[PDB]
């Protein structure tokens, strides 16, 4: 997710495109990446398969999958191209674009410090938890009978416009096997797929009705786009972009499918026999998915109240494959119209982010961080109109806009195992292929309107998802009065000062180095610490990608000139002392395969076995 996940896969790429070998900033030109067209070959597969049988040590098998997957990719292109005959177009001359590059970052040396006995590391971590979090360290006294306790008490829900069968509401637990954790953090296990959990998750009541597409709604949207184009964008690209539309093209589909992996291509291939046309695919029908992981934050709140259940609304598989070739062009056009001091995390890597903010943040500087998650976007219909107006200005072809618009109105969801039907009104968060883009556009628009001209005169601004940071801005009564037109809790704002109250961004800390004198971003150690106290399901063999992720994260923590700063940042955020010992404990855990085995224990089986 964004920077890096627990398995070190992340959402960002790993190729630098914003690096230069000169001590000054240089403007360059954006180019295109050529893609190899797949080709079909059956005679090679037949002979290789027979040659696979006679001798295959290690690389002989790999040639078979590469040949087999390559055949599947060619077949998908041939079938997919025929469906969208009424929307296919050709290549028109492109509009050139330019971008700015920055010099490479400088880092301080790192020294490794670790203990020897792995059991002592567990004792230190347990001592740290008890001293700082007394209630959390005394919760576990028996096994994990959460499923049984949830069945004993009844079902409480707050639904709206839903139907279900009462005869299928039964929640007797099934077999559950896991490994007993060693760290005394009480991280819950993922929930079981039952009808009771589905109703508990859908306990949200956002029933609000306003003017759908009337005159007052249009007036608010018209003002919003005016502020965005006046305080956050330059005027050198609008007229050129309107002349050249964006349409579905063979190159878009060929490039997209080639980027998929093995298993993903096979899954898509299985749904190409009865291929519906593009105009036949419904755009307002979704399916319900439950398989998720619970989210826990440092503190003592999960030992008193049960956490919520996460859900996913999945769209049609063919809908996200026909039109997913226009995401790259939309990103390029958006980056071209933004001001040089306004940045977006799309199409960047970890190193590029460090080089941009290398010489901007210094001690004693005020930074404003604001999130917009706590806001009901379903109350006002103008939030959807504003996004469409921005999309139309960017140069989206007219019939394609109708297909996109159909997914932002009335939608329905269904649960296949139980046949449960749900209906929702205007919704912004979903599982479609424009979710981050629309959220980023709305985040910039909200900030631009509230801050007015204070956004233009700034040193560095970064926007991604629902989080943002703006340099050199404080909190005054003018923004409170402007934002209090409807209510007061639209957004949450926090004031931060470098080297005194470290700013928080995307689950990390922004710190200023001492030896070199440059800014850098590091991860959150407490978030990792609670995560090692999560039970591991039996039969899982993913205990090697996590060790490498921990090893990389530990090295970044032990850089010289950042030990003292990290201590103060954690204390000013969570009011906790003594994290250097925890970091040392993490170092010895991620040193060998056998040292990582001390975080687990004997296997415990519940609700299973007729003995």
């Amino acid at each position: 997710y964004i920077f890096s996940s627990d398995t070190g896969q992340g959402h960002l790429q790993q190729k630098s495109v914003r690096q230069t070998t000169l001590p000054v900033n240089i403007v360059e030109e954006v180019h295109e990446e050529k893609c190899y067209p797949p080709k079909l070959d059956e005679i090679k597969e037949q002979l290789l398969l027979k040659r696979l049988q006679e001798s295959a040590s290690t690389a002989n098998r790999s040639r078979y999958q590469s040949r087999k997957v390559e055949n599947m990719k060619a077949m998908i292109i041939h079938r997919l191209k025929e469906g969208c005959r009424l929307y296919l177009a050709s290549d028109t001359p492109r509009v050139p674009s330019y971008r700015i590059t920055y010099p490479a970052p400088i880092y301080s040396p790192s020294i490794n410090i670790k203990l020897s006995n792995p059991e002592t590391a567990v004792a230190v971590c347990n001592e740290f938890l008890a001293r700082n979090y007394p209630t959390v360290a005394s919760y576990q006294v028996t096994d994990e009978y959460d499923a049984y306790l949830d069945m004993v008490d009844g079902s409480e829900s707050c639904l709206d416009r839903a139907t279900f069968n009462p005869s299928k509401l039964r929640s007797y637990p099934k077999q559950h096997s896991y490994h007993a954790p060693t760290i005394r953090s009480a991280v819950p296990s993922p929930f079981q797929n039952t009808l009771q959990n589905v109703l508990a998750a859908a306990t949200k009541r956002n029933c609000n009705v306003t003017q759908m597409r009337e005159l007052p709604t249009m007036d608010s949207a018209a003002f919003n786009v005016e502020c965005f184009k006046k305080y956050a964008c330059n005027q050198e690209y609008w007229r050129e972009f309107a002349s050249s539309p964006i349409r579905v093209t063979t190159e878009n589909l060929t490039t997209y499918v080639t980027k998929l992996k093995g298993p993903k291509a096979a899954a898509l291939f299985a749904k190409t026999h009865n291929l519906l046309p593009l105009q036949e695919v419904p755009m307002d029908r979704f399916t319900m998915d439950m398989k998720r992981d619970v989210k826990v934050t440092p503190g003592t709140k999960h030992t008193e109240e049960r956490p919520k259940v996460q859900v996913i609304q999945a769209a049609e598989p063919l809908a996200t494959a026909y039109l997913c070739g226009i995401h790259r062009e939309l990103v390029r056009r958006l980056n071209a119209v933004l001001l040089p001091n306004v940045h977006t995390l799309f199409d960047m890597s970890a190193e590029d982010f460090d080089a941009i903010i290398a010489t901007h943040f210094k001690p004693g500087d005020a930074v404003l961080e604001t999130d917009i998650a706590s806001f009901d976007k379903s109350q006002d219909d103008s939030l959807a109109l504003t996004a469409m107006m921005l999309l139309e200005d960017l140069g989206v072809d007219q019939p394609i806009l109708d297909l996109i618009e159909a997914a932002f109105g009335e939608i329905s969801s269904c649960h296949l195992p139980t046949g449960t039907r749900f209906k929702f009104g205007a919704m912004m968060k979903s599982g479609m292929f424009l979710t981050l883009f629309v959220n980023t556009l709305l985040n910039i628009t909200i900030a631009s309107r509230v801050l007015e001209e204070r956004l233009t005169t700034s040193a560095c601004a970064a926007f991604i998802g629902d989080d943002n940071i703006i340099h050199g801005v404080v909190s005054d009564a003018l923004m409170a009065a402007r934002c209090a037109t409807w209510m007061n809790m639209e957004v949450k704002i926090i004031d931060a000062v470098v080297s005194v109250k470290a700013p928080y961004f995307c689950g990390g800390f922004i710190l200023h180095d001492t030896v070199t004198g440059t800014a850098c971003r590091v991860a959150d150690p407490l978030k990792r610490l609670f995560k090692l106290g999560k039970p591991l399901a039996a039969g899982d063999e993913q205990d090697e990608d996590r060790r490498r992720a921990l090893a990389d994260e530990v090295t970044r923590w032990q850089r010289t000139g950042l030990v003292t700063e990290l201590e103060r940042a954690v204390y000013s955020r969570y009011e906790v002392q003594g994290i250097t010992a925890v970091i040392t404990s993490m170092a010895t855990f991620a040193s060998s395969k056998e040292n990582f085995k001390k975080l687990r224990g004997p296997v415990v089986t519940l609700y299973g076995g007729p003995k």
């Binding site: 004792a123 347990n126 008890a130 001293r131 700082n132 979090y133 007394p134 209630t135 360290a137 005394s138 006294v141 028996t142 005394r184």
Partner: protein, 466 residues
């Protein structure tokens, strides 16, 4: 309101309030004493006792400090022999206080007290309504109430009988609980009052609460005398309350574990009872009522009710360079015992039990604040407690795989086998019963009295009272 001299922020306030629901306890500290908890309980207990009885009654004090009962509204008669080193200092202190207040408080019969003291100093053998120099046997004053406060140097059946023939119908006793001494233990502790006691034979131990040892290198073989080959408790026991040392004897301690009902024969016959009124983590208050005649029958049983956890296990320690084994005992808080029942269903190693106890101990009412966070139990007794639980779980398992027939015993012709027992664990809300003696018909009096007062001491008191 009742004021106690303990710290305003400590965990002992809740226990005192719960054990005395008819009062109001307010902390007010003026002295950093090392035995504040011990003195606080005694102050409350004596206030309750004097409040439960009617006024205009005469009261005897066996172990008496006259300065303590000087500003009271009751009628106390003090019995003060001269058999202790504390006695000369207390007598001089009493005289100084009396002479220092003669025209300030004319409400407690100060003039009478001074006159009675002077009369005794003239003739040592005289008896006065307030002071005397006899013992509990040689005193000849009539009353109906007797009070014992921290007395461990008398024989209970003999002392009680001599008080009955003088018209006493009620008695009170305040002191330590005598349950651990009925189990024939070697050492023990009272964590709530910072009290440690140990037998004289293990004073050179290494890892107990009252010991001292040196540093040695190690030698194989030493010169010695005829082999002992035994290690059993003796009659001498040493007590340490705070920083003060008290020697005691086992026989006189066990004599106060009186049965529910017993008879006192002899020249005159009486029937007796015994009940426990207040109990708080080691201190008890007992009430004894006596009546002439002979009624009912006796069973000779004693019952103790446990509101906390009681533990007794076997430990291995090095005494004077030699490895031996003996037994210890202690008390455990109720909350800790209640939360350990989920892990004792299986077999656990001592290391695992220790880790759970540590994590479960820092949980305190004031949470992360370390002002009132004195922990649930003292940390120096955790290692020994962890071993006891591990041994208990192992023994509770072997019983399950050796089920037998219902009703009949098994001898494999003769020589039935006995099993090992290494720990005794009494859970809260349980009772313990022992067999004792409940009939006494052997009373002897020396009938000889020797004075203990000296000439220079008498002169000093006379000068002070001048």
């Amino acid at each position: 309101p009742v004021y106690v001299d303990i710290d305003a922020d400590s965990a002992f306030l809740k226990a005192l309030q719960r054990a005395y629901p008819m009062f109001e306890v307010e902390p007010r500290q003026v002295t950093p004493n090392d035995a504040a908890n011990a003195r606080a309980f005694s102050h409350l207990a004596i206030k309750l006792i004097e409040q439960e009885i009617d006024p205009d009654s005469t009261i005897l004090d066996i172990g008496s400090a006259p300065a303590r009962r000087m500003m009271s509204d009751r009628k106390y008669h003090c019995v003060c022999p001269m058999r202790s080193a504390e006695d000369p200092e207390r007598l001089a202190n009493y005289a100084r206080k009396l002479a220092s207040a003669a025209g300030k408080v004319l409400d407690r019969n100060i003039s009478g007290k001074i006159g009675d003291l002077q009369a005794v100093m003239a003739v040592p053998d005289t008896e006065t309504p307030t002071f005397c120099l006899h013992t509990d046997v040689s005193c000849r004053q009539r009353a109906d109430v007797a009070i014992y406060q921290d007395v461990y140097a008398v024989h209970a059946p003999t002392s009680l009988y001599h008080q009955a023939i003088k018209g006493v119908r009620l008695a009170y006793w305040v002191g330590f609980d005598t349950t651990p001494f009925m189990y024939n233990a070697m050492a023990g502790a009272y964590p709530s009052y910072s009290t440690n006691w140990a037998d004289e034979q293990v004073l050179k131990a290494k890892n107990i609460g009252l010991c001292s040892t040196d540093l040695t290198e190690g030698r194989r073989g030493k010169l010695s005398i005829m082999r002992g080959k035994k290690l059993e408790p003796c009659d001498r026991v040493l007590f340490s309350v705070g920083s003060t040392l008290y020697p005691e004897s086992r026989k006189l301690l066990k004599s106060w574990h009186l049965p529910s009902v017993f008879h006192l024969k002899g020249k005159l016959s009486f029937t007796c009872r015994c009940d426990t009124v207040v109990s708080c983590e080691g201190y008890v208050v007992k009430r004894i009522t006596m009546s002439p005649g002979l009624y009912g029958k006796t069973t000779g049983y004693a019952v103790t009710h446990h509101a906390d956890g009681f533990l007794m296990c076997k430990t291995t320690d090095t005494v004077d360079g030699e490895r031996v084994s003996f037994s210890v005992c202690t008390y455990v808080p109720a909350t800790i015992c209640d939360q350990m029942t989920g892990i004792l269903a299986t077999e656990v190693t001592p290391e695992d039990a220790q880790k759970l106890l540590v994590g479960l101990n820092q949980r305190i009412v004031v949470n992360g604040r370390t002002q009132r966070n004195t922990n649930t139990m003292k940390n120096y007794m955790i290692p020994v407690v962890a071993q006891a639980f591990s041994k208990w779980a192992k023994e509770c398992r072997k019983d399950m795989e050796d089920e037998k027939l219902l009703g009949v015993r098994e001898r494999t012709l003769w020589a039935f086998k006995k099993q090992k027992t290494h720990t005794v664990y009494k859970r809260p809300d349980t009772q313990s019963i022992q067999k004792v003696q409940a009939e006494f018909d052997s009373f002897v009096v020396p009938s000889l009295w020797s004075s203990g007062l000296s000439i220079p001491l008498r002169t000093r008191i006379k000068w002070l009272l001048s």
